[PDB]
Design a protein around this ligand. Sequence first.
Ligand code: 50C
Ligand code: MG
Length: 713
Amino acid sequence: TDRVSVGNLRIARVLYDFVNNEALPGTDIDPDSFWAGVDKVVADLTPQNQALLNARDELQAQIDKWHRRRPIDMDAYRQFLTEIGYLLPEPDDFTITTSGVDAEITTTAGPQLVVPVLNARFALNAANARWGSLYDALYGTDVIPETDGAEKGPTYNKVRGDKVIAYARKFLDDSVPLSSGSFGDATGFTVQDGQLVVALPDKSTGLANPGQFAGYTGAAESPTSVLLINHGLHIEILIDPESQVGTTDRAGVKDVILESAITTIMDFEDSVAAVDAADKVLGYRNWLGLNKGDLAARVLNRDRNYTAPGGGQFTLPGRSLMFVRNVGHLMTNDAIVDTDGSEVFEGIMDALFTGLIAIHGLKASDVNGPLINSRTGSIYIVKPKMHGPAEVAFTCELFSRVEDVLGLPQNTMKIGIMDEERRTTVNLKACIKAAADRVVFINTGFLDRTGDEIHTSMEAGPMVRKGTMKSQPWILAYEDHNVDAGLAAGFSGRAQVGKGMWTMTELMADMVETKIAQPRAGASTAWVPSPTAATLHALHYHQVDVAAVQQGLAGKRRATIEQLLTIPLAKELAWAPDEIREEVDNNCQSILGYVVRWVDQGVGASKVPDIHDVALMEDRATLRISSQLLANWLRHGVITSADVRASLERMAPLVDRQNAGDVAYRPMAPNFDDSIAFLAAQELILSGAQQPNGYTEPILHRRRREFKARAAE
Ligand SMILES: Cc1c(-c2ccc(F)cc2)n[nH]c1N
Ligand SMILES: [Mg+2]
């Protein structure tokens, strides 16, 4: 084979070479020591990693049997969950003690981007998306309707531009109010005595609250830009009377720039396809470039310089503070195998390598690269798919052991707890407590959590449709319970409380209209799928004072355990055959749509047309929910495997047409049984009920390396 033997490890050569020649130099960690560290950590933590995975199966096996042996009695259901150790007791009240955390996280509320780390240009754009032009965001999207001669065309539409300008002016009025008059009638800006002064046609005024003036560039008598702050977020008015847009503008204004994506999550998990050592190195290679601060295709933006209202120079971050999202506890990867040939656990590998690489982001020099990520010295790892408090404790112990190998102070590696499995939801307080000195983030989502919901209660009966799930009692309790737990553990001012991703990348008007609900619910952050979306979602943090919302929610217990445990069973004869048919086709094409690009092209995140040609950018969770739903309906006789195959066959050509604009694409229809993508989609459904916690990675990872194998002959 082509591996390097170290202790019990057989490291893939490409990985070994990458760590030694690219990752290690500059960290002052001795190579041989590092690799012995890896051998040690892997040997020491693998058994516990395995025991936890076995605990999941044992619990699920018990719940399965419980449902088979029986209108649910909730007292008995609950007592049973307590008996098997699924429902643990709730700890007393406490406050997290996590320290050395950047201000982006402790204090600032705002958008958070997620991006596939394997895609360097996407990753590049995300990092630079800390600052984004509101004009570009408004003009380029449907937030401004195209109706009244404001349509987009191959050239700039001045009528549309004026609407953009008016929209921005009104934003300024709502966010940084003048003590009298509107920004719409502004004629110019001057800095007079460390104060911003705004010229109107008939007078001059300052800010209703002068403290919102945070700086400027250029001469104080005629600034090239004015920097403003609201709710901890910065607004920059660019002033340039001789630019084209400036010439038409009443105050010479050229653009309004918003501090947008305050933090970004570089993703190694559900948005990327990485099934082997070659894929993993590409991943780690981009993350290195980002932390070194030298990755380019167009560079990483440098920090922005301003003149304080007083008179000195200061510097504001120009990049989005980066987190990394490791894979979770389940999967193994062939990047490392042991002597007998067993693949090493992928999450353990991610903590070591993504942690090692992140050392470079803690300082600027020749050997570490020019740009700094964390200014406080933290490495931020989001850890997905944890089930309960013991799996959290294990993560902390892993990070603790990784810190020792890497020579870092204890608690350097912070953890972001994704709350997307049921056993975490109902034990959330205990999960946070288990990370009380490392936690900087909790969040919620729809697709994975609902996937787990369906899998856990697979045997209980047919579940409601996917669309119906969004409004079920359990999920509403789950959303509120998340925020409550976080606030009760002292998160406001200390850690992020996040909500889920907006997936409809083209429906920006809808996003601006409805996504405001998340800050209003007290989320200090929420996920956006693009830099444009980050900019538009930032408007919400200007309209909503999240700090104040979180304060008003304090001490409230809005979710009962009974609500959390309400299984989304369908009622009697809830559906007409056309409705069943609609739902089946829907899920079949969401699986096909996502799966063809995963297996054939190693893409896990992209604008995928849904059954009604709406463009969604979902991650791999879309497979979990969809497949678990179909498997649930199969198992209870709502549908048949014939219906499923016939649906998949009906939807395959449609997916084929929706990818016409693509060169690399290879149709699935009409030779279905020779498409590895098509067979994967079909396996995901017919084998769905048998997968551990309904996870799709085992089948998906296998099919992708099958496709890659066929490519190699
Ligand atoms: C994180 C996520 C995404 C996603 C992933 C990568 C991107 F670049 C844009 C969105 N879709 N759905 C979820 N839950
Ligand atoms: Mg997930």
